[PDB]
């Protein structure tokens, strides 16, 4: 059969605007043919780590639906996106299960997500009282009470829960912006709509 309904990976990898790590965008990929070879054609990847599956055998497995999570982080925080990792991003921004079945793709974006005067449009939650559950997103922006008195707006002991990265081109690698895409493969009881190319 002729290959039809290619899964739109370019809308996720070649997107102009990437979401923040606290409001990571989840795109549902279902009912399409997934050619995992066109991934290397978008941009030179810096990291390609597949967990639970083999990257070369991805074209042979059929799945029901695939979820693509995209966000921006710094270079030092790309180590936190992994099953069973600690850190401010891995605990309070985006956490993966211990039985995660998928691949994480990361690449440096210092040429796009960095401004000469500082790109303060990307926010991250520094700390929360309870750690996030796997695949949980916290978008609430209520003022965090660091002291022992109830808060009434921004102050000395009050804190806005979201902090900006401030990416600058002169920053060394590690503080430069990195765009990360996380793929989750789901095997439910429904018919597997996402299959690989058949030749």
């Amino acid at each position, epitope marked *: 059969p002729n290959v039809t309904n290619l899964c739109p990976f370019h809308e996720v990898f070649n997107a102009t605007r990437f979401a923040s790590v606290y409001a990571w965008n989840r795109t549902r990929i279902s009912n399409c043919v997934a050619d995992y070879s066109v991934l290397y054609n978008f941009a*030179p990847f810096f*990291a*390609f780590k597949c967990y639970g599956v083999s990257p*070369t055998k991805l074209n042979d497995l059929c799945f029901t639906n695939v979820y693509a999570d995209s966000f921006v982080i710094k*270079g030092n925080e*790309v*180590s936190q996106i992994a099953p069973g990792q600690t850190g401010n991003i891995a605990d309070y921004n985006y956490k993966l299960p211990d039985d995660f079945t998928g691949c994480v793709i990361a690449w440096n974006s210092n040429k796009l997500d960095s401004k000469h005067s500082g790109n303060y449009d990307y926010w991250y939650r520094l700390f929360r009282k309870s750690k996030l559950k796997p695949f949980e997103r916290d978008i609430s922006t209520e003022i965090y009470q660091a002291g022992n008195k109830p808060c009434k707006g921004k102050g000395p002991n009050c804190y806005f829960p979201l902090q900006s990265y401030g990416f600058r081109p002169t920053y060394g*690698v*590690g503080h430069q912006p990195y765009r990360v895409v996380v793929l989750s493969f789901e095997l439910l009881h429904a018919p597997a709509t996402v299959c690989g190319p058949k030749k």
Partner: single-chain antibody
Amino acid sequence: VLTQPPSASGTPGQRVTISCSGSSSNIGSNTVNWYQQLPGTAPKLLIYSNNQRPSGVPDRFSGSKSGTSASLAISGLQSEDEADYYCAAWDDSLNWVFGGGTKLTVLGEVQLVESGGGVVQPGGSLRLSCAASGFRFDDHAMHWVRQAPGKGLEWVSVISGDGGSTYYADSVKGRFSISRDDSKNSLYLQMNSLRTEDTALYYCAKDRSYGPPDVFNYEYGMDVWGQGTTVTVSS
């Protein structure tokens, strides 16, 4: 372990492929690198990301990876292509593995200076130093590679750009210690309890990647090589 053909041959003008067989934990899972070492010189990075080529490398070299195997195509052989070619990759066992090397025979500025070598008794101590110039020292990882006289390359240790992640080979585990000093652009390697097998030519290599190879498993590569120092373990 990566398996390479022991030798290869080709007349000028032809193309010669150099095979490299690995496991699912080094090739396929991670990326493959290729290095050229002319007789009496330091190795040169030829290919990274399994198909990418640095700026100062001719277009005659092309890389390919299919599953757990890789190959290097050299179209239009010249007399300058007669050298040793190594297959490199990062194994999921947290160690850098070289392919042993394939000797090719034809028929018809960033600088790293190293110091600290010498002759020591079996069981002594020695510390090697490496001075770096011409680049941001904290943005690039550093490697240590030794080469026995007339033998192949062997990876020793690696330290990340931030100095947080350090990995050592199984042969030198518990005896060698790596450290960096960003304030003075120096790379150190403390060698304790040396064996006779540690007699080799130690190289100081700069990595094009910042983080450790297990995190950035798709862009690592020993870009800049320095003049090695000879250590001798003799009684």
